[PDB]
């Protein structure tokens, strides 16, 4: 009825008063609408969007890439890919075994492994990726587990030592510039 836009319509549990036409959010965005021919309240959700990140081992090593659709359920990327309605026309090959649902998005092109290594390429939410060939996605390992042998009357004292030299690099000054506005 003149209220135009794009979104996904669904049945809403909101109870409109019988004189209202639509709804608004706390940020003055439309959240519902009443059908002029059915008098039912239809929730409106925006069509899915997000970022796209490409994981690269480096062109010096391989031309394989893995694509991360940030903030998207894999069930809706696969639906839109089949129906051909995803803005980025290029499509990563999906062999079923290379599609993984991370907490950051849908990761395509990387085979998830149950092992854990030090993080090479940080993806997010504890998941990293590396090249090992193919691209593997794993949950990063924080370090080697250790258990000190604590006891009531046991102490460990070093019998030797090591002189180590470490280097620290600190920026001190920028580059001075002067600009003539005119």
């Amino acid at each position: 009825n003149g209220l135009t836009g794009t979104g996904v319509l669904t049945k809403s549990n909101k109870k409109f008063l019988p004189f209202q036409q639509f709804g608004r959010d706390i940020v003055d965005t439309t959240d519902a609408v009443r059908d002029p021919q059915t008098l039912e309240i239809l929730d409106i959700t925006p069509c899915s969007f997000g970022g796209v990140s490409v994981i690269t081992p480096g062109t010096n090593t391989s031309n394989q890439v893995a694509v991360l659709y940030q903030g998207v359920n894999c069930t809706e990327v696969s639906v839109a890919i089949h129906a051909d309605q995803l803005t980025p026309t290029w499509r990563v090959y999906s062999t079923g075994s290379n599609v993984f649902q991370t907490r950051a998005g849908c990761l395509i092109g990387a085979e998830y492994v149950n092992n854990s290594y030090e993080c090479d390429i940080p993806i997010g939410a504890g998941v990293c990726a590396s090249y090992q060939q193919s691209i593997i996605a794993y949950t990063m390992s924080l370090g080697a587990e250790n258990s000190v042998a604590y006891s009531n009357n046991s102490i460990a004292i070093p019998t030797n030592f090591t002189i180590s030299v470490t280097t620290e690099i600190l920026p001190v000054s920028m580059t001075k510039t002067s600009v003539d506005c005119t």
Partner: peptide, 23 residues
């Protein structure tokens, strides 16, 4: 005629827009 206090009434719905749990 006379004069009386109106208190806190006379409030109407300014539009036909649904809003839930908002100020």
């Amino acid at each position: 005629q006379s004069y009386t206090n109106s208190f806190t009434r006379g409030v109407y719905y300014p539009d036909k827009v649904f809003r839930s749990s908002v100020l």
